[PDB]
Design a protein around this ligand. Sequence first.
Ligand SMILES: [Ca+2]
Ligand SMILES: [Zn+2]
Length: 392
Amino acid sequence: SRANDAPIVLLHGFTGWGREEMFGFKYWGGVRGDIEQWLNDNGYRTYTLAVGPLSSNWDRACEAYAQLVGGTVDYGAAHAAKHGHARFGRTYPGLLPELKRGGRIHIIAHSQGGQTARMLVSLLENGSQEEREYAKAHNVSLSPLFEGGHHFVLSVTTIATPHDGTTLVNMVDFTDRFFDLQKAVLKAAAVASNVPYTSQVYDFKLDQWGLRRQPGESFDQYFERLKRSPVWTSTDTARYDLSVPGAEKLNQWVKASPNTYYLSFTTERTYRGALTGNYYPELGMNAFSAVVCAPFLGSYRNATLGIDDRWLENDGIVNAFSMNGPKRGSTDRIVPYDGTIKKGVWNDMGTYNVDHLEVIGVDPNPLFDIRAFYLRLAEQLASLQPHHHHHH
Ligand SMILES: [Ca+2]
Ligand SMILES: [Zn+2]
């Protein structure tokens, strides 16, 4: 059924790190193994992007663009001046120079990665008018990313993505709990949060903000500085983009490309309480989510905000209702999968009973055939037709 040869590129969310980080414990595979290696082993050429887990989708897309084709990250002169961080970031050799020669990729994105992938597609195709106009008005140079006209992306697949935000950000103790989540992923990787490791271990890639863990600093201490830093206090952050208002703002400009396939997977790991209408964690959900996040997600309503009952089912971290595609402030279409994947529309591939971390293998779930999950997805992506023609 193989109808294209595009390689697959994997993209994490508000947690995530390179293949060499976390002592080789993989974000994509966790305690289950190495998802990229499984795909490559099965004949599906697969790569992995690592970008700032806490950075805005904008920053991450700029980082992803430079990580793909090579070069020094360029966040755009207008954006950098706007938010007060460096215009230029780290330099990359480029994972896929074939992209500079018409090649295309499939992106498989988990969590906030889904937002980033969508945004990258948009900047690639449309560029940024704001940047272009700023470059002409200030006589500054312009990254090719902002010119538009790039078509690197044949498909985007999002898994557990908060396309409409997650109400988790609304928790009153969200900042302290969000970083506890980072601590919980570290723990999953068997990494302590109260130890000043001399090796990097987990690089948050805050080059633009000039933030990095210092010698003698544990992750606990590091996170306490991050909490008070601009990567947590600004609107140019994952924290803002993850929020319902922030995701809506994102949706208002980040539209689905008619040249690109979109697949969404929804995840859920909760049950409904008959008398309260709330949703509750099941048995099997990662311990941190079950205790600290799922109860809030499954009970938080806010009429002002648009959060009614539909939002309560969740995967421990993200409202399921947010996952099938952008809706809030979005002109994108979403169709249930009907056997045939269509261009320029969100193909809701269905809802899977796995939690936010289980779906990438970071939390165990031996009832979830994760190997089969990604293999079946790879097959589906490789079957996507470059072209279509009307028929009866
Ligand atoms: Ca589990
Ligand atoms: Zn930025």
